[model samples]
Structures are given as structure tokens and as C-alpha cells.
Target chain A: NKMEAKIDELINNDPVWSSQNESLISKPYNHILLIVQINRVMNLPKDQLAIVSQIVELLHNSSLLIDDIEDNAPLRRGQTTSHLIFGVPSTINTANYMYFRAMQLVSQLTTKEPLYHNLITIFNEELINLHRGQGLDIYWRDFLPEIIPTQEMYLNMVMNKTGGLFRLTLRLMEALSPSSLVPFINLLGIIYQIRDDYLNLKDFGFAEDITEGKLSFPIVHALNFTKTKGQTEQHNEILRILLLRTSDKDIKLKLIQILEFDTNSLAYTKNFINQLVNMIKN
Target chain B: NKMEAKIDELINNDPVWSSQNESLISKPYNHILLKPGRLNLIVQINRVMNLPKDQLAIVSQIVELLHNSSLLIDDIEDNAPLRRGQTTSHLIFGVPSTINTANYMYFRAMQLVSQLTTKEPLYHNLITIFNEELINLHRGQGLDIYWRDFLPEIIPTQEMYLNMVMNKTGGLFRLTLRLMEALSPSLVPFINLLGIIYQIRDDYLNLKDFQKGFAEDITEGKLSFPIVHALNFTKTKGQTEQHNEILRILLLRTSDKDIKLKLIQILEFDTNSLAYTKNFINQLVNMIKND
Candidate 1:
């Protein structure tokens, strides 16, 4: 009930906004909170944590709301999507409205004028990256067999879309703390996104990405491998099932089976994620 | 086509957003509210701010873009069908691309700030003006949407509603003037008072124009000034049944002619809300006139 009050406080704040509406509609703002804690390993001050946490999480949850709407996703973090309960009109407005609320927090982060400007520029840059990445993903799905991006293009998109929050959090904390962890965080972002794409099919009943017919990592690998291997009919079959955009279990299994046997895309993607993670570990 | 390439170029260079497929769904950005009838008050205000002649149009263009882009998103969010008597952008482009384009324009608007001055301090000030008002706009909008969507649940008082308008309307109004003033260093206090009066007039007129029935704020169930005033007025005056009826109508979220007319009649005759709103706009406007 106190959380409900916090939501009320967020949706309406007079002189200023209240703290931590981060993940108000979902769980606690744990992942973003983890981001701030991860940076504490660099001595990011306890004082500045609250402000940055608010900024990053605002973008996170807001984008999640938009992501669901764009993907026509039915579930998010294991629940009915925000737009479904609140309706798209209200959900889009509220989620977008929250973005500025995050932007407002940048002013509160530091008193130093130069640092303030730097933080804002960082904020602006990353948000643009986010939408760019997200826009490409939406484009690929919506356009479908129109343009199937290569592994490189998909990786590049991830660097922008998924890595946006990653770079945003890393860049800001790097600006605050003396030692920079830019490359390491980037590696983490890449691995995390690839694994996420893999998991959507692996753990979420394969229906999550399959129903939406997204050209996710494994799907891309599967498509490309079939073409490259001269499996003409098999390639078309993969494209056909994806284009169906069906929730039928047997139909979904056909596509998933194609990824496994015809193309070996599932093994390739898993190995790909593992190598990237091991790149960081070693 | 050349201008299309230009926008694409602008998006890609300083910011590598080339991965975006904004162009795939792009159209000439429309402003449902950018009717030729309204003054580019910011232009005259810029003249008053005595802005350096060269960059005046740039500042003006940025403001108009941000304002119009917000309208594109707002129409979709409110589910309003007509904007400036044409089908809204999201209606044409569909929500996905319209959202991406509207959002793209916002960053483009921010990108223009760097052009304001190479001098970092002034650039920072311009950005602050831009960012702060935007936050204010969203804060007010967030509450407005929350109240409307959850209508029988959370009724805002007249005080709450007015304060909300002050932030929402004041945001765009202030953003334009604030930027112009940053360039020039002085603006009349009359502008500030005029804003308060200006918003109340706009809100009042939205319902008034729509009463002849061309898609009014009431059909959107907007918590416009009159709506706020009526909701509170009926409650405080012990018009309990009338208050309940008003709440019920808003919750309907309908555009049916009969339903729309019924709500209009309640505001006009039963609550005297519309007539009172006309006077309320005057009492407020009479300030700038008296000043």
C-alpha cells in the first residue's frame, strides 16, 4: 500500500518528484539498482547513487512499457503487460511522461556545472541510442522477410539498443569515479543481450520471440546458415514458419526444430554467448 | 526528398541513430494544433526579447517542432481522431513509427541547442530551459492522464487541477519565452500572467468549440479547467447527484453524439459550469488587461 502511495506521489509531485517509482508496475528496481551497486565497486558515492538510480531506472521501465507495445508482447517479466491493463493510450503517455521525469533527475545529480552538462549529454546520447536500437528491432520484425540483417548488423543494433542503458549507466559512473570500466561493461552488455535473445526462445517456451516473429539472434543465425549452406527449401521453411506469427505449439516447435537441426543455430548462438562471456572472464 | 535526407543526416552525424528505420514510416511532420489561426506569439516575443536576428528563426523552429511533435504523441495517447481537422499522425503512420518519429524529433530539437551558442554557459542555460520545461510538461501531463484514465478513482481538487495546468501549459509557454529571454535577457511579467490566462482561455475554448460538437475536451474526458471547476463545484455545493453523473459521463470515455450532448448539457445548464468557466477565464484575463 505504501508502494501504491509512492505511485501516487510519482504520478503527481508538486515541488519535486518522489523517489523510486522505478519498477512501480513491476518488481522492485532490482537490475538497475544492481547497476548502481556494481558501480559502487568503483567507489561511486552513496550520495549520488539515488539520483543516478532514478535516472537509469526511469529510462529502463519506460522503455520496457514501449517495448511491449511495439512487439505486441503479451507478457513482461512474467505478467500481463502494462499497456494491456492500462490500455495503450494511457500506458504510452504515462511511460513517455516518466522519461522526462528521469531527465529531470540529471539536474539533481551534481552541482558542478560542467559535470551537469556532461551528465545530460550522456543522458541524451544514450536515450537516442536506445530508440535507434529499438527502432531497428521493430523494423526487422515488422518488415520481416523484407530485410534480414547480418550477424554484424544485429550486433551493432544490440550495441545501441541493449547497450544503451549499459553504456548510460557505465558512462555516468565512469564520469563520477576515477577509474573507467568502459570496455568491461561493454563486454558485459554484449554477452547479456545475446544471452537474453537466446533465453527468450530457450526458457520462455520459445513462444515469446516466436509469437512475435522477431528476427532475434538465433533466428538470424538460422536464416543466414540455411542460405549459406545451400538449403534452399529449408531456408524457405524457416522463413515461412516465422512469417506465420502463430502461437500454435506444434507450429512453434517446427521453427525451433529448424533452428536446432537444419541450421544448428541454437548451438551456434549458445557458443557465441559463451565465447563473449569467456572473453571477459579470461 | 532532399529535406528527408537532411533530417536523416542530422540524426546520424552527431548521433549515430542510423540504425533507426524512422524514414521507412516517415511523413511530413504535422502539428494537429499548428493551425495558421494562432499567432507565432514566440516570434513577437522573440522580437521583444530582442534576439539576435540571425538565430531567431532557428529558436522559433525548434519550439514549433517540439510543440508539434508533442501533439503527434498526445493525439495517439488521448486516442483523439482529429487534429486541426485532419486525421492525426499516429492514425496515419500507425502508433509504432509515429512514436519513433515523434521521439526522433525531440532529440533533433535537443540537437538544435548546440547551435544556440558555442559558448558553453549560454548553451547550458538554453538546454536547462529546454529540459526543465519538458519535465514540467510531463509532470502535469502524467497527472492529467492518471486522473482521466482512473476517473472515478482519484478526483483532483480545483487547486490540484490548476496547479497541474500551471505546470503543463506553463511548460511549453515558458520553454518558448525562456529560450527567447535567454537570448535577449528580459521579458515582461505580463507574459507570465498572460500564460495563466492564456491556458484557462484555451481550456475553456476547447469545450466551447467542441460544444457545437467538433471533438471537444469533454469527449476526451479531459480534466480541463471547466471540468475541474465543475467537478469540484458540484461536490462543494451539495449537487451530489449531478456530481455523480459528471463522473459517470467522464468514465464512459465516449464520442457518441447523444452521450457527448448529455455531458455538454450538464456542464452548460445543470452545473452552470460552462458559463462560470467563461467568466472565470475573464476574471483571470482581466488581470493582464488591468495590469
Candidate 2:
């Protein structure tokens, strides 16, 4: 209870949270809530809980700031992004400050055990993976001859880009917990990432990743099913048509049609999800 | 002698060093030498001593990678820099890949250190500091009026910017030696940061700090005769003119300027150097106890 109150106080009073101008508070506040949620789930020991909470908040904020910068995203969660409102320069600087602040927090945990160093290693690795994924995404957009993408390649990209952070979050939670929970948390992380990727492809109407010449799992599965039916040219023509279509509903319908027309494609996706669930169970 | 040879081998043959493309290798290596030379002197360790030599090489490579990325990104982001007497990275590889390659190398240290967790706290701290410093540099650049000019008011702006990286490099060096030395090493770190900051400011043209509308200082000098004249307004119209001239020189100077008017200003003017030095030393001392 005492720890929870301290965390609540931190969430309420953090300079990053409160420093936002009145108009820019909503998304940043939501980002801060995500940190708190992660903290509550991790449930680290009392002695080290505050540091863990602060680190999570810092990482979450830095990621959001950098993502906004990368996407040049003007609005987030129905409000102007911190980058758009605060200016790209301030957003970048604030992100860097958060990173430094996070490191300072990590340094505070100077226990004799190697846990701190291990956590730092894991976090840095995820950062590298995220950067690499971003690199590939940019590469596909800038140089690829055609924007028609396949489902398998799309899954691989999102797994590295989006799933990388999810995996790191779970790894961090595992690091904070006792050793026995590490594998369990790792498995949970895999499932969460797969679920996240599914949502981006299925639920999110904006599948810019596909339209922009990047391959994703749904498109890959659709193409594979079409090929099995020997409709190779037809599949290619459909992809070209889908890539050219800008209306959200048209793209949505085409994506849904790909799933509906192909039982094999649906089965492949279900098999992938089942594999993820099995990992969590075992 | 044996240590020197080991250091040479590491510098020449380390996988990171050797893996660089010929083009990267062809760039003038002088900047790497100067920064580390200053760092070595500040640490007060004999460069030839085996342990210090190896440590100095590690520090040199890390600083080199950092300075390379900074110059690379500054060229593209600022859109006006010509670094090391050559076309900028953006010009060479185009902006997109240049930035990606720089990002790639920035995290290469993580791969280097992943297997070394059981080694020493100093190694762990070094990796942490290097990664964190990139963020610090980004933050500092974010404060640059050229970038964030859209903001109406910039508070704690320049100080926060410079101090962020000052602690990064200087603080890293301080901790590096402190962790390496088994005994009485704490006091050594105390003096190390002062020397590092003094050298970095000197190298980067400290006058820019004051003339950039961020901070200012005053100085007095002596003449041969009993007649003494106050250089009364060192803050004269000529100063601003001189400031712009130096800024132009900085933009134009193809390589690092070791002995510019800016360096002289930092070295001779109490206004410029004394206040910064005192504050840096005080902070270094404070960190010793608190850290």
C-alpha cells in the first residue's frame, strides 16, 4: 500500500507528466498510466520498487517521444503529440533527458548481484533491435520497387519493431521478480507481442505498413493461398489494386476478403496464435 | 612496453576497428587522437603504462564512435556542416542510410559488452554511460535555438544542454578510473572531471557559450608600464562582431581548431574560464560524496 501510494504520487508529480502544457497532457498522462500498470504487474520488492517504477516511466516516455519523432506523427490519442505540441527539438531533448534519468535510476540499484547489469544489457539489446527494425522499415519504403507486401514479411518486421518493446517490458518484469518466473514472463511476452501484431493488422484500420510496400502476415498468407490455387497473376493484381487504394474502407474490405476467401490463410493465422498460447502454457 | 604493444594491437585489430569500411578508415584520425590525448592527460595516467594504455584505447574508441556520430548527424540535421575536410555522411551515403549506419554503430558496444557482465562495475557503467550520453547529446541539440526556435522561451536551456554531456564524458572518465583503482581512487576522480571539462570547453570554443546569449563573464590584464587601462568593456560592440566572426570560422574551419581566438578567450579571460572551472570543480567534488 505504501509503495502503491508512492508510485501514485510519482505519477501525479513527475516533472515529465506535469511539465506538459494544459493542451498536451492527455496522451502523456495516458503514457504515464501505462507505466503505472506495468509497475503494478511487476510487483518488485519494497526496497527497490520505486526505482523500478521510475525506470519504467522513463522508458515508456522515451519510447513514445522517439516514436512520435520517427513517425512525424502530428496527433496521438486525439491530441497533438508531444513532438507536435512541444516541437520536435523539445520532444527529442525530453526523450534524451528521460533516458539519462532512467540510467541514473538504474545506477542507483548498485546491489552486489549482476541483475542490474543484466537488465541494462537486455534493454540496450531491445533498443538495437528496434532501431534495426526501423531501418528495415525505412529501407522497404525508400528502395523497394513495389509496395505489394506479403503477410510473413510483415509479421517479421512488426515482431522486431513493435514486439521488441513488448518483449523487453516482460524481460524487465522478470528481472525484477524471482528467477523462477523468468521463463513464464518470457512466454507471456511472446503471446502479448503476437496479439499486438494481430491487432495492428486486423483491428487497426490503418495498415500503412502494407500499403507502403512492406510485407505483412495477412498479405503473405493471402498470397500463399492464392498461389496454392494457382491464381498467381490474380493475386499480384489484387495486391497492386489494394496498395493503390487509399480509402480506409476499401483497404479494410480487401483485407477482410483476403481472409474470407482463403480458409488456408485463416488456418495459418490460427495455428500461429495457438503456438503462441502453447508457449505460454508450457 | 608489453602493454603498449597490446594497446596497439587492440587499437589496430579489434573487431570493431577492423570491421570499418575503407572509407571510414580513410577519414582523418586526428580528432580521435586529440580528444583521447586530452582525456589521458586529465586522468593523470602515463599513456605508456600497460593498464592505463589499454584503458585509454577503450576510452579513445568509445569517444571516437561518439564524435563520429555527432559530426555525421550534425551535418544532416543542421544541413550545413562539412566535417573533417570531406563531404558529410549525408552527402556520401545520402541522409537516410547515413543516419541508419550511425545508429547501427552506436549500439555496437552493447554486443561487445554482453558477455562481460561479471567483469567489473566500471565496464558496465561505461556501456551505460555511452548509451545514455547519446540521449544527452540529442537533448542538448534539441535545445539548440536553430532547431527549437519555434519555442518562445527557453529556460535552463543551454546550461542543461552543455552540462548534460559534460557529465557524460567527464563523469564517465571520472567513474572509469575510480572503479579501476582499487584504493584511494576517489580523490583522483575529483580532479579528473575538472580537467576533462576544461579541455572539452577549450576544444569546442568556450566563447560560443557566452556569446550565444546564454552566459557572460569579465576579465583583467596587465600592461608593462605602471599605466593601467581597463579593457573596461570587454563586452564591447567589437565582442559581438568577434563572436559572429568566430561562429563563421567554426562553420568554415574544416578541421578542429586547437588555437583559435576562442581558445585564447577561454584560456586567458577569467570571465570565460574561471567561473566555469570553479563550478565544475565544485560539482565534481560534490558527486564524489553523493555518488
Question: Model 2: which residue pairs collide?
Answer: A147-A213, A150-A215, A150-A220, A151-A216, A151-A217, A151-A219, A151-A220, A154-A215, A154-A216, B218-B271
RMSD of each: 7.3, 13.7
Q: Per-residue lDDT of A142-201 in model 1, one digit per residue for the tens?
A: 678899988867877777777788889978887877545655665677678888878877
DockQ of model 1 vs. true complex: 0.22
| Model 2 chain B lowest lDDT segment of ten | B221-230
| CAPRI-style class, candidate 2 | incorrect
| Local error of candidate 2 at residue A42 (angstroms) | 6.9
TM-scores, all candidates, are: 0.83, 0.57
Query: Candidate 1 regions off by >4 Å?
Result: A1-43, A86-90, A179-184, A204-206, A226-245, B1-22, B25-39, B185-189, B210-213, B236-241
Task: Give the true-structure RMSD of model 1.
Answer: 7.3
lDDT of 2 by residue, A195-265 (tens): 54456556653654444433445456666677678986657755664456343566665666666565455
List model 2 lDDT by residue over B151-254, tens digit each.
21322322233343343344344434433342112344344445344544443333355433211111111110000001112233345554433334333423
Q: What does TM-score give for chain A of every model?
A: 0.86, 0.65
